[PDB]
Scaffold this active site. Structure first.
Site, mmCIF file in Angstrom:
data_model
loop_
_atom_site.group_PDB
_atom_site.id
_atom_site.type_symbol
_atom_site.label_atom_id
_atom_site.label_comp_id
_atom_site.label_asym_id
_atom_site.label_seq_id
_atom_site.Cartn_x
_atom_site.Cartn_y
_atom_site.Cartn_z
ATOM 1 N N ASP A 1 -11.583 -3.896 4.886
ATOM 2 C CA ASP A 1 -11.117 -5.260 4.650
ATOM 3 C C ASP A 1 -12.187 -6.329 4.410
ATOM 4 O O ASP A 1 -12.495 -7.097 5.277
ATOM 5 C CB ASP A 1 -10.146 -5.694 5.762
ATOM 6 C CG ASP A 1 -8.823 -4.932 5.719
ATOM 7 O OD1 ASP A 1 -8.570 -4.133 4.783
ATOM 8 O OD2 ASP A 1 -7.999 -5.169 6.616
ATOM 9 N N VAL B 1 0.821 -1.206 0.000
ATOM 10 C CA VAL B 1 0.000 0.000 0.000
ATOM 11 C C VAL B 1 0.855 1.255 0.000
ATOM 12 O O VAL B 1 1.883 1.322 0.695
ATOM 13 C CB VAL B 1 -0.988 0.011 1.184
ATOM 14 C CG1 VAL B 1 -1.853 1.273 1.155
ATOM 15 C CG2 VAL B 1 -1.876 -1.245 1.149
ATOM 16 N N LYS C 1 -3.449 0.456 -3.224
ATOM 17 C CA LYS C 1 -2.993 -0.916 -2.962
ATOM 18 C C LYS C 1 -2.671 -1.600 -4.270
ATOM 19 O O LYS C 1 -3.535 -1.725 -5.115
ATOM 20 C CB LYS C 1 -4.064 -1.738 -2.228
ATOM 21 C CG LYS C 1 -3.663 -3.209 -1.996
ATOM 22 C CD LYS C 1 -4.418 -3.897 -0.851
ATOM 23 C CE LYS C 1 -5.928 -4.107 -1.127
ATOM 24 N NZ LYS C 1 -6.553 -5.170 -0.164
HETATM 25 C C1 LIG Z 1 -6.002 0.454 -0.211
HETATM 26 C C2 LIG Z 1 -6.975 -0.490 0.456
HETATM 27 C C3 LIG Z 1 -7.960 -1.104 -0.316
HETATM 28 C C4 LIG Z 1 -8.887 -1.971 0.264
HETATM 29 C C5 LIG Z 1 -8.826 -2.256 1.638
HETATM 30 O O1 LIG Z 1 -9.745 -3.104 2.200
HETATM 31 C C6 LIG Z 1 -7.828 -1.652 2.425
HETATM 32 C C7 LIG Z 1 -6.899 -0.768 1.829
HETATM 33 N N1 LIG Z 1 -5.928 -0.187 2.598
HETATM 34 C C8 LIG Z 1 -6.041 1.053 3.166
HETATM 35 C C9 LIG Z 1 -7.150 1.870 2.941
HETATM 36 C C10 LIG Z 1 -7.226 3.130 3.525
HETATM 37 N N2 LIG Z 1 -6.224 3.573 4.308
HETATM 38 C C11 LIG Z 1 -5.133 2.799 4.547
HETATM 39 C C12 LIG Z 1 -4.112 3.272 5.367
HETATM 40 C C13 LIG Z 1 -2.983 2.503 5.622
HETATM 41 C C14 LIG Z 1 -2.009 3.032 6.469
HETATM 42 C C15 LIG Z 1 -1.134 2.206 7.209
HETATM 43 S S1 LIG Z 1 -0.103 3.290 8.175
HETATM 44 C C16 LIG Z 1 -0.902 4.731 7.542
HETATM 45 C C17 LIG Z 1 -0.563 6.137 7.885
HETATM 46 O O2 LIG Z 1 -0.891 7.045 7.117
HETATM 47 N N3 LIG Z 1 -1.874 4.396 6.676
HETATM 48 C C18 LIG Z 1 -2.845 1.232 5.067
HETATM 49 C C19 LIG Z 1 -3.866 0.755 4.237
HETATM 50 C C20 LIG Z 1 -5.008 1.529 3.981
#
Ligand SMILES: Cc1ccc(O)cc1Nc1ccnc2cc(-c3csc(C=O)n3)ccc12
Length: 345
Positions: free
Chosen positions: A161, A31, A46
């Site tokens: 998720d 990601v 992602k």
């Molecule tokens: C891109 C995606 C798509 C589908 C899903 O179910 C989850 C994701 N993941 C995330 C979506 C929204 N915000 C996220 C944020 C993070 C993240 C981890 S540390 C951080 C600090 O800014 N941000 C990781 C994954 C994310």
């Protein structure tokens, strides 16, 4: 038209994305946080890992994209964009998913600040609002836990998720949060589960918000079942019948019978209405648990419940789940779904 794409290596992986996405920064498929110059949004991008490596992987990629394409609800993760650098099906190998970037999860909250009863009302209300929507489409989350509930500075919440790779046996072993929120019937494969498993997880999550402590921190599946039955009582004859596994039924009958505890004495000081709702969520017999739609109307949520602003979902066709296809067929279905994506307004 096709946007212009640009390439970069972001530790060990090549990212090829439309120009609109700038300032990609690895945060976690991999990601990246990014700035969407077109919408002015901070986004998470992602890149799916090895999306069509096997039949099981190609079907899971399709499943996750189908699910994310369908969710349009304030309290559920939505898809802002989906793209591939490929110009045709023949060259299609990578899928990128774009969503709003989420700062904090519920773990960050429960763990680093005190939650008033009003905060618990708001947070749980929003989970149940998102679940009424998810369940109305016959989608079961199956893995609700604080780490997949994103929460912004205004305490606004989204369920994240779904369509994710099923946990390995090892990931569910021992003293692990990956199992602490799971309904007993799915934890021990007692029977064919359904959407009521999600309500069990909300009860575990709501009690943790109220006490600041995990409700059932078992050291393994058996220790966890024991923690659970201590609180909610051992099953009666009626629930035993419904346990289709002869082995599990037989084990559970070896246990000393215990009555349901008094939840007012477990959740000392809690709003009696919270206590009542927890009693209606944390019922061993999944048939008898409160539903999301029912819980929204529970008096604990009087301050937030608006029956005119708790929407249901459009119908969701998951007949694909029972379909047996080849990798390239699952891959072609996914490509169709990438190509036909329409952004939200
Ligand atoms: C891109 C995606 C798509 C589908 C899903 O179910 C989850 C994701 N993941 C995330 C979506 C929204 N915000 C996220 C944020 C993070 C993240 C981890 S540390 C951080 C600090 O800014 N941000 C990781 C994954 C994310």
């Amino acid at each position: 038209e096709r946007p212009t794409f640009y390439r970069q290596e972001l530790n060990k992986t090549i990212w090829e994305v439309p120009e609109r996405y700038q300032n990609l920064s690895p945060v976690g498929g991999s990601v990246c946080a990014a700035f969407d110059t077109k919408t002015g949004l901070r986004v998470a991008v992602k890149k799916l890992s090895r999306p069509f490596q096997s039949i099981i992987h190609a079907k899971r990629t399709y499943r996750e994209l189908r699910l994310l394409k369908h969710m349009k609800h304030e309290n559920v993760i939505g898809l802002l964009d989906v793209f591939t650098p490929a110009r045709s099906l023949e060259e299609f190998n990578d899928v990128y998913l774009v969503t709003h970037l989420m700062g904090a999860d519920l773990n960050n909250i429960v763990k680093c600040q005190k939650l008033t009863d009003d905060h618990v009302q708001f947070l749980i209300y929003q989970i149940l609002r998102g679940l009424k929507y998810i369940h109305s489409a016959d989608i079961i989350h199956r893995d609700l836990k604080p780490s997949n509930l994103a929460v912004n500075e205004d305490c606004e919440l989204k369920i994240l998720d779904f369509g994710l790779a099923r946990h390995t046996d090892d990931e569910m072993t021992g003293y692990v949060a990956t199992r602490w929120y799971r309904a007993p019937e799915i934890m021990l494969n007692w029977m064919h589960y359904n959407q009521t498993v999600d309500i069990w997880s909300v009860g575990c999550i709501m009690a943790e918000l109220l006490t600041g402590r995990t409700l059932f921190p078992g050291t393994d599946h058996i220790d966890q079942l024991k923690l659970i039955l201590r609180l909610v009582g051992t099953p009666g004859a009626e629930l035993l019948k419904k346990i289709s596994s002869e082995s599990a039924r037989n084990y559970i009958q070896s246990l000393t019978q215990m009555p349901k505890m008094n939840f007012a004495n477990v959740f000392i000081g809690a709003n009696p209405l919270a206590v009542d709702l927890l009693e209606k969520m944390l019922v061993l017999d999944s048939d008898k648990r409160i539903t999301a739609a029912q819980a929204l109307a529970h008096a604990y949520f009087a301050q937030y419940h608006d029956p005119d602003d708790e929407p249901v979902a459009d119908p969701y066709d998951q007949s694909f789940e029972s379909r047996d296809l080849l990798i390239d067929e699952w891959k072609s279905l996914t490509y169709d779904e990438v190509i036909s994506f329409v952004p939200p307004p």
